[PDB]
Subunit: 347 residues, 2 copies
């Protein structure tokens, strides 16, 4: 059974999770260095250099499936590396062609579809020589997932989350003036199925990968039911994924204002409403997580996400953001502890 007490959970993270994450991550770093196209190489290495924490955090789900520990971390790391690589490629495109953004994100859907024939995901952009990097990442996922006893039961739900994540990456990276009309029209198709929320709250709920890793984790269990597959998707989507991205956008506010970049928090009528809605998402997230298997573990992961996000220098060394962050959620001083701990190690 998974560790649910702080000491053994932290001990297993430092002893087993991080060394195993970095064994697989460091191999992708070496592979990325050999990418022929200098722009694809730069974008790959940048994501690997800057977004290590996504794989390190993602790898913690390994603890729920000890008997498939290495395979599950390998899947999560390959999929998460792809997301951060493709985000860079869309972010740094001089061309802003949505066909390119869509074509690239179809790599994530292929990763979740064993035997899906691999295409030129780069077909709508000038840079196409990656020396097999993206293909290698896709096949890694395909060959691992097919070996999980209940992958077939969760596949449809993983594809649902991955398509929504892809649609977001397409709409939010097009030329500035076309973004919000695309996001509102897209939200409009799903708004009936969703709890009552705005286009920009919906946009945040689709932007996380946590549901995919959770569904892949339970795919390792014998005889997982379709009822359980749906419980597990509803555990993280929409509310936990929402809080995750609302936090990402909260921390990044000052640089989004400075670089006139799309920030979903900016479409709230005022900050009072943003704080109220953030607190609602947190309550609905607590309720959705409590429905999962291993509820105490999921509750630990989520509290960890919140504390780690709020421990950012961008929040903790900015008097107004820090004060606003405590209005949003009280974490018994954990964000601040992680900041000063971090500040102390790196000096």
């Amino acid at each position: 059974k998974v560790p649910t007490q702080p000491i053994p959970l932290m001990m297993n993270i430092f002893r087993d999770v991080l060394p195993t994450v970095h064994r697989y991550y460091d191999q992708w770093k070496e592979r990325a260095k050999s990418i022929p196209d200098p722009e694809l190489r730069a974008q790959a290495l940048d994501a690997l250099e800057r977004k290590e924490f996504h794989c390190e955090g993602g790898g913690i789900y390994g603890l729920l499936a000890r008997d498939r520990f290495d395979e599950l971390i390998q899947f999560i790391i390959a999929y998460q590396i792809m997301c951060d690589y493709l985000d860079n490629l869309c972010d740094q495109s001089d061309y802003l062609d949505p066909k390119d953004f869509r074509s690239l994100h179809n790599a994530l859907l292929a990763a979740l579809t064993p035997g899906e024939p691999l295409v030129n995901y780069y077909q709508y952009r000038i840079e196409q020589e990656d020396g097999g990097y993206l293909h290698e990442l896709i096949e890694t996922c395909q060959h691992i997932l097919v070996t999980f006893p209940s992958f077939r039961m969760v596949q449809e739900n993983m594809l649902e989350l991955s398509q929504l994540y892809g649609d977001l990456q397409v709409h939010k990276h097009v030329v500035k003036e076309e973004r919000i009309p695309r996001l509102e029209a897209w939200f409009n198709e799903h708004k009936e199925k969703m709890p009552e929320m705005t286009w920009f709250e919906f946009s945040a709920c689709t932007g996380s990968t946590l549901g995919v890793y959770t569904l892949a984790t339970y795919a390792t269990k014998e005889g997982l039911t379709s009822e359980q597959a749906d419980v597990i998707k509803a555990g993280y989507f929409p509310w936990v994924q929402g809080v995750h991205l609302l936090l990402d956008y909260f921390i990044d506010q000052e640089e989004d204002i400075a670089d006139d970049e799309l920030n979903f928090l900016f479409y709230y009528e005022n900050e009072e409403q943003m704080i109220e809605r953030f607190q609602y998402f947190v309550q609905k997230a607590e309720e959705s997580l409590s429905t999962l298997p291993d509820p105490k573990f999921h509750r630990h992961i989520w509290r960890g996400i919140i504390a780690i996000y709020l421990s950012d220098e961008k929040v903790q060394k900015n008097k107004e953001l820090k004060k606003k962050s405590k209005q949003m959620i009280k974490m018994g001083g954990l964000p601040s502890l992680l900041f000063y701990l971090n500040s102390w190690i790196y000096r």
Copy 2:
């Protein structure tokens, strides 16, 4: 209103204690570079290089005296730097003269005796030109302690612990053949006023500075009685100071074997007696710590000391030492967590 819950205690340590300690420690580092005698300078800078942990640890007592936070830490750092400097001078002496060791350790007594004129502490050795380094360490302690409203009530108890510490350093640093006779002779002078223990256990009890820092901490309070000063001293001496040094000697057994250093544990008649007496000291130490003001704070600092000591790779990588350590004290998974955390940070 002293923090005793783990998250805030740790946050204060990383935000307040460690940065304040390193501010003053760094000023002493720069001051030490101005020492004229090359050998005194090398020994002062080597102590400062290798022994920052003693100051970081000692500085945690600040949190019991927030009012005088900066002043108390300046006293603790000045005294501890003096201790580690004198320890280097006595260890690396080519002339092993107990007049020199005694004269040097008389600096600690001067540090605790404001308004009394200073000698040449180097009067019994070749190297004498330190440019006022040792006098400035003494003067720093004197100038802070006089400002403590209850210093006068604790000064006798502090000088008592400083005298025993000085005595130990004198006897343990002489030529190998005359150590145990001095230590046994010295213990026999004190045997009748001490609880039942060996000369080598007594030696362990006198070798810590925790009692001095704790008494200095309660000197910062108005209207401390003689009774309360005797309670505070008895809370650390002898049992807590004994556990602190016995644990140091336990961890360094292979080192002290290989470098042929004096190790008080080796004079137990067998391992089983060693473990049994260690367990007894722990019981008495738990008892004496529970008699203190802010007993939860003292318990936490003491369990932290122990967890940090036992987390040493010297213990965690050695099957036999790990086995014995878990017999000696029940710490749960904390030493192991600290080991894998340290292993991860310093990879």
